[PDB]
Amino acid sequence: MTPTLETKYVFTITARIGDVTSAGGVRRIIPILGGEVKGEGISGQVLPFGADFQIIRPNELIELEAKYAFETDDGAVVYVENVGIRFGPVELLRKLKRGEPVDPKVIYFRTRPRFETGHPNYQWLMQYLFVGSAARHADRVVIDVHQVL
Amino acid sequence: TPTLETKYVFTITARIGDVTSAGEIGTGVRRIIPILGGEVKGEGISGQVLPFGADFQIIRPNELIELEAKYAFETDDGAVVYVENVGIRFGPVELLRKGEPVDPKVIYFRTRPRFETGHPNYQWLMQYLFVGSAARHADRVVIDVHQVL
Amino acid sequence: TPTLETKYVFTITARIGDVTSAGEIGTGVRRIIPILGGEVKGEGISGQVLPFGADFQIIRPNELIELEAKYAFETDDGAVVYVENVGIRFGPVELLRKLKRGEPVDPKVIYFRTRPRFETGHPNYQWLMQYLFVGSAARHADRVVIDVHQVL
Amino acid sequence: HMTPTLETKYVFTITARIGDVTSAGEIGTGVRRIIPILGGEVKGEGISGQVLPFGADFQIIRPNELIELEAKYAFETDDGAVVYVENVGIRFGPVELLRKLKRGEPVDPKVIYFRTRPRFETGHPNYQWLMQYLFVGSAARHADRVVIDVHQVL
């Protein structure tokens, strides 16, 4: 019997982004300006600070390393650390890097968000591992967060 | 609803030595568990965990365990893969307290293994995310590795 | 007995914003401190810190603060330097408790040292990645001043 | 206008016995290599310890031969503290001499830039100070060992 893994979609972080700044493989920084969080029991707004600090590998692959927060309706403040990778066929990666729209289903964009809260309700966010499956647009990054069971 | 696809790729069995503890360090007990060896098995994959490295753990006040293991394996065809395996182990307090034998299907024990190699046939190990589902026994940790698609 | 030589090289000054707190992780209190501008300054390296990134912190039960600031400046040459500044702030607990209420405490009487690491592709500031650096820092209400010293 | 100053004080030396290089290869950013830590000693005033027989330095050699170090190990003192060490830094120098070091050939440590930031974690009451200061290490690479002179940043 081959080993099995079960996961569960729980919620979606949409993060609004701004212009990129590049250091020169290549280090670049993309500011997080806002956004929202939506799922069963989760409703909150991404806070207007933080950035994704990225490395572009020589093969056009993107190491993502974002640190931000969100605040739920409850008053729970949740620190987000979202680490991962975006890859796929090279010509499609050059389109995104331009701002030109690409179908997210054709791209590989997977992350591991970690969460930190002291809020008693959202302690579960620290007791499980999560995998994100994301989508890149010019103005936003849509992350579908799945709970590893 | 958003969906996520994964697939079993291989199992890492890391043999572990004696626990060394640094004590309580403000934020959870720092403990270290030497890696002595082991095996890596899967489709077309056959290798040995090299005899060095450690798991560096933090135990939180609540018996939850943050894991951070850094070690390596070598496949039969000569690929050397550096492994950074970061995770959490959790469950009923009594069972966590139990080096007595416990059934793994009650413990939450999931990790994110991240791989580095130069071997042409394992490049895919750095181009995907992976999730581990692990089981702890007294002499070894058995880690089933699933590729996130 | 072994010796260590260092050289003061330049001063950072990251203008920080309102504090946002996430609370107890069981292992300390997590807080975030945006960085919205400010200046780097010294010999042959003048520049501006950029209005993004933040200080992400843990406050230990004993009230020591471990800092991890990730931010960037751009110099006159047009170099973009990415900075990661990891450090600690400690002292007798009374003085530390004044430092959040936003009270002027003389930086000499408080221990605030960091290790700032740099990344550039710019061929003129390549030396930033070839040495280790130590910040000796100081805490204010609106700003934070960072004396960068090169380890030789 | 007064040029800021930094004061340090030498506190102790860590001598780590190192094993054979395992190399994972080119990772697109440099070459990943791993060097097992076999033992060693810690010594200074009011600190005397033995480096425990486990751990490793996880390294990246950049294409200019700069080495990024990231060593994780532990020592135990004679009076019963266990201290976890995370030692992160760089080794650089003239390429010929870096290559000499790779071949296990003796080089004078003065011509090699070899500096790190050691970070300690311990529960032991007497060594609590190890997590209350920043430290800088000035080190030396030999064929069989690494010698880090640890300085407390004041």
Q: Reduce the secondary structure of C73-99 to three states and give it as a string.
A: EEECCCCEEEEEEEEEEECCHHHHHHH
Instruction: Tell me which chain A residues have a C-beta less than 8 angstroms from the C-beta of C17.
Output: 49
> CB neighbours of A71 closer than 8 A, spacing ≥ 6?
A44, A45, A47, A77, A78
Instruction: Tell me which chain D residues have a C-beta less than 8 angstroms from the C-beta of B83.
Output: none
Nearest-CB residue to A23 (from C21, C25, C82): C82
- Distances in whole angstroms, Cα of residue B85 to Cα of each of A99, B47, C8: 35, 17, 39
Q: Of D145, D137, D143, which Cα lies nearest the Cα of D153?
A: D137
> CB neighbours of C106 closer than 8 A, spacing ≥ 6?
none
> CB neighbours of D29 closer than 8 A, spacing ≥ 6?
A25, A57, D60, D62
Instruction: Tell me which chain B residues have a C-beta less than 8 angstroms from the C-beta of D74.
Output: 20, 22, 32
D interface residues, B as partner, C-beta within 8 Å: 19, 22-28, 31-32, 34, 36, 52-56, 58, 72-74, 76, 81-84, 121-124, 131
Interchain contact, A23 vs C50, CB within 8 Å: no
**Element containing residue D100 per DSSP (H, E):** helix D95-102
Nearest-CB residue to B129 (from A9, A126, A131): A131
Chain A nearest CA to C63, separation (Å): 17
Domains, chain B, in order of start with CATH, read 1-149 (2.40.160.20)
The angle subtended at Cα D95 by Cα D89 and Cα D100, nearest 5°, is 90
Interchain contact, B60 vs C28, CB within 8 Å: no
Q: Measured between alpha carbons, how far is D115 from D95 in angstroms, rounded to an integer?
A: 17
Instruction: Tell me which chain D residues have a C-beta less than 8 angstroms from the C-beta of A59.
Output: 28
Distance of CA D107 to the CA centre of its chain: 17
What token pair was written down for D151? 């300085």
Instruction: Tell me which chain D residues have a C-beta less than 8 angstroms from the C-beta of A58.
Output: 28
Interface partners of chain A (CB pairs < 8 Å, 3 or more) are: B, C, D
Parallel, antiparallel, or unpaired for β B130-136 and B29-42? unpaired
* C57: exposed, middle or buried (Cβ count in 10 Å: 0-12, 13-18, 19+): buried
- Per the CB < 8 A criterion, the answer to whether A90 and A119 are in contact is no
Interchain contact, D36 vs B25, CB within 8 Å: no
Chain A nearest CA to B121, separation (Å): 16
Chain B nearest CA to C90, separation (Å): 14
Query: Closest chain A residue to D27 measured between Cα atoms?
Result: A57
Elucidated via: X-ray
For testing the chain D interface, which of B32, B84, B123 should be mutated: the one with the most D CBs within 10 Å?
B32
Q: Measured between alpha carbons, how far is C134 from C9 in angstroms, rounded to an integer?
A: 10
Interface partners of chain B (CB pairs < 8 Å, 3 or more) are: A, C, D
Helices then strands (H, E): number in chain B? 1, 10
For testing the chain B interface, which of D17, D18, D21, D22 should be mutated: the one with the most B CBs within 10 Å?
D22
Q: Measured between alpha carbons, how far is C108 from B97 in angstroms, rounded to an integer?
A: 47
Q: Measured between alpha carbons, how far is D102 from D23 in angstroms, rounded to an integer?
A: 13
